[PDB]
Symmetry: D2
Subunit: 295 residues, 4 copies
């Protein structure tokens, strides 16, 4: 037999960092969950019981903490690049590092209309993520994303004109609820290395912000013909506002809210234009994906 | 053998309701998860296979939808009271109804600084809950709560002066991180029935708001001597602002963020006043509870 | 204001213990999750910022490990009794200890038809639990349970003869699927203290075994008239086989499997006696509870 | 802009099927969760709001039920192949179908040492999965797997000889606990289509069985030098017993059980050879992956 591929590392590394402005007294926290997987000339660990090639996952964990101590952890695209570059530069036999970072929200509390200096709230489970692949001799591949952004619009979504055949029971509609959990990924142009990533650092938060804004505005304002159509419109605008983006990927469930016919009870009218009470469905759900790139 | 106690019903009933202001065009959504458990003279269903006494849980589900269609679903204390009262009034052999409601957040989206008429976002997993017990001849017992309110303060929490003995390894501290998931319950004075509940309807949202505000303000401003001390201060203020409240209960985990000693690495200074990078602990966690009432 | 009730402690304490038979070479593992909540004269921690009365939750955690090191951890009813008794005996101002233990399964692996000496498998998420309340001057209250026992029978369940009114749409049936997650609790007679608990130690595993067996046999053999009826039959037998049990409580969801009408497609026959493909429903679900005691 | 890639479909489709042997009276159940994602000439749904190319996800759901009604659902490799082939054969503009199936366990109950004809138990959360990719003109690509197989061995695992540098704090050990959740995937040689898949149907359950057995036996009998080494030995044997397998992939977390030093308490000895009580760690965890193919 032969090893075709191999990676190993430490997953679910939770990290908190605080920043304290000794002048203002203002504190800022960052919390994330880190995964680092390494690749290289490690095959003999598997086939010959040779642990000499193994950088212990425990040591990988240590490195994460130390790197966070010595470098900024924001924006996460920079921190992930610094951490992955470390492993390939530091170990000769290690040629690729895969760094996944999930950023948790800690939003500054407003008290009495004033921003509080050291108190924070988790104002949703929405995540900001990065996947950073650092490969010896091939630079730094960064995919940024937002996930867990849960939205609903109560009208101005439609779905008619789809294929109808003998498997079809769904009725066309000109007014429905649209709810989804947004997963959006933007892939940056390859960077030659850390110097290039650092030259672009302001672009990372601004583009996350843009992506979020565009996502929210388009969902709220588009009179949606389908999930497919609306998501293309989001991807298009993002690509239009940030030239260093190569592709935008969207993955969107369609979380169904079913009308409930109550006519069997005293002729109660609860469908179509009289629809007021709906049953959210846990499963199944539609799943719509698309990757948009430059033409 | 004998049946000492029995209840049965329908759990995990998801419900959505939309309200449409035909004048403004503004829509407002409500989403909740409902549990209804009934008690009464139903013992023979268990001992004699006599299903005649059973109101099918399927029918309970139907009733929930119909009630939501015909009545306001907000505030949830009122809706739960209406639903529980229905079952005890409608069925002779049913003498108590237990209604649990979890309200999910759907917060109106602001677009371009303007509030959007029909688009919403789940701006956290914080829940607003009610437990409503409706008992034939004993009125309506309501417990209101907020849960899943996740907060963190990065300083102005202390913990020193606790009991030290041969089981103790914890060091006293004058500056630590405090993070918790707030579970807060306020128990209303018993209501004689629906008319009384309706007479108090404005008090329910205002008190939820107050409880939330007090909870947030006190956490952010208290230089906490312990979780115990801070939570008492919250309970006290709530009781002070709403006389129809009999008791306030708080249940607060202490979600530990451990200092990481990096001194073993190039003498890196990361503890005490140099503490910048911390390891959030998933488990174990402290759990602190208290019920405060009127003196 | 005044403190009406208070408890505090350490939750989610994961513990593993190994036992090694140096003669046979056979090893046996135990894994559990422990919660310990204490009550006593601790009110001033809340009202006066007085931490002197607080046994740190960190120390509670330590005590758990030490107790497990020095005592058997099986059966869990004994271990919980030892741990709770410790806190009330050791601290003067602490008058009650609440110990919750969840036991995780680690079942010995059979290899080549032979039992393996030190390898184990998690052969389900079924748990064995105990809740032990140790109260100064009132002895030791133990509730034992099994939970997460998921079963299904594909026929020999019925549900007809229930109440029908204008809220009812459910059809009577003489053949349906019955699936549930079994939660069963048996409450022991109060014990005067540890000596009495130790005198009964063999009864704890045998009764857990009996409860499980009775639960499984009755579910499989009863031609069920309803969930209510079947669960009473389980409770009754358990009470009949173990006199030191005061009450048996059962909590059983009814996890619905809905028939799917495929007649709209080429007249496909998939209901009633032709029912072959079903849609498991995630929610809502029926929830049926009962407490059976001695008559 | 341009669409680079696109797929859409229905996820989280729960399906139950019962088989009844009218001769023996014996019933057999199958429960699974299905995801079907389609690809083809659908780009205009995204860019031109053209829903004519869309096979509604609702219809996909229907098709799943109908296919299960008309075909065997076991082994899942066959059922997934039948379902994916359907979509590409049935719709001209649809050129690929991606079918994911998770099979849930429903193990026949033994009562009184006798197998019960219609009662089942979920004897773990271990899953049997298939991923089936059906691509017009390129045949049928099947990946089979088991997942959620949770095991532990209490001794006969070692980890020494790894790389030590200034990031390393981990100590070498010759005796530790090894616990993991097994995720194992075997990739079949490409099949030309359904006829070929059907010719191999007996090989699918036998190979799942083999993979499981080899996995269990090797974990229990290997005196493990590392996770890497042990998993290679599993992959190798599987490849050796089934020639139609092209590659075997393993993904294995290392779920750490940390020694607890209790020496600070009355000189309690709980480490190294005296190690009896351990603290399972929820996070972080090691993550070890490898793909083994034919040499
Ligand atoms: Na390198
Ligand atoms: Na009544
Ligand atoms: Na005491
Ligand atoms: Na086709």
């Amino acid at each position: 037999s032969a090893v075709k591929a191999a990676r190993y590392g430490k997953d679910n590394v939770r990290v908190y960092k605080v920043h304290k402005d000794e002048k203002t007294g203002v504190q800022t926290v960052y919390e994330m969950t880190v995964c680092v997987l390494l690749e290289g000339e490690i095959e003999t660990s598997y086939t010959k019981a040779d642990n000499s090639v193994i950088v212990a996952t425990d040591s990988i964990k240590n490195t994460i903490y130390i790197t966070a101590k010595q470098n900024p952890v924001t924006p996460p695209e920079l921190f992930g690049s610094i951490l992955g570059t470390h492993f390939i530069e530091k170990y000769n036999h290690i040629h690729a590092a895969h760094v996944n970072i999930v950023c948790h929200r800690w939003t500054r509390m407003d008290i009495d209309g004033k921003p509080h200096p050291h108190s924070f709230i988790r104002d949703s489970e929405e995540k900001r993520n990065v996947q950073v692949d650092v490969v010896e001799g091939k630079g730094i591949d960064i995919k940024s994303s937002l996930s867990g952004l849960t939205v609903l619009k109560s009208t101005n979504s439609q779905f008619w004109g789809f294929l109808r055949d003998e498997y079809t029971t769904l009725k066309e509609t000109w007014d429905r609820i649209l709810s989804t959990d947004v997963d959006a990924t933007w892939q940056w142009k390859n960077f030659s290395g850390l110097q290039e990533v650092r030259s672009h650092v302001p672009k990372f938060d601004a583009t996350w912000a843009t992506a979020r804004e565009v996502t929210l505005k388009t969902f709220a304002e588009d009179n949606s013909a389908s999930v497919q159509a609306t998501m293309y419109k989001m991807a298009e605008q993002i690509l239009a506002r940030q030239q260093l983006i190569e592709t935008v990927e969207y993955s969107l469930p369609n979380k169904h809210y079913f009308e409930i016919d109550l006519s069997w009870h005293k002729g109660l009218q609860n469908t179509g234009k009289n629809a007021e009470v709906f049953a959210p469905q846990s499963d199944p759900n539609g799943l719509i994906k698309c990757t948009v790139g430059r033409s």
